Design a protein around this ligand. Sequence first.
Ligand code: NA
Length: 89
Amino acid sequence: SQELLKDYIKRQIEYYFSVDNLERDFFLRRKMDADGFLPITLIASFHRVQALTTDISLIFAALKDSKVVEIVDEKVRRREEPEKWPLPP
Ligand code: NA
């Protein structure tokens, strides 16, 4: 139920941080800081995520113990070599 919704949110956000998406998603990379971090609330504003939920606790929960992304406080980044992806804003 909410477990199912969490799975869709997880797969969607993990896609944003995939190499396949990152090679072409210049908007996302222009929003990263130098360590590759993005605000989780920015991800929450993306159309395909906001359609699924506006519950920020559910969005955080979907990403807990992800093998693709790392959460530090309010920010999220790709786990593997995040620093290679940021672009000038
Ligand atoms: Na936003």
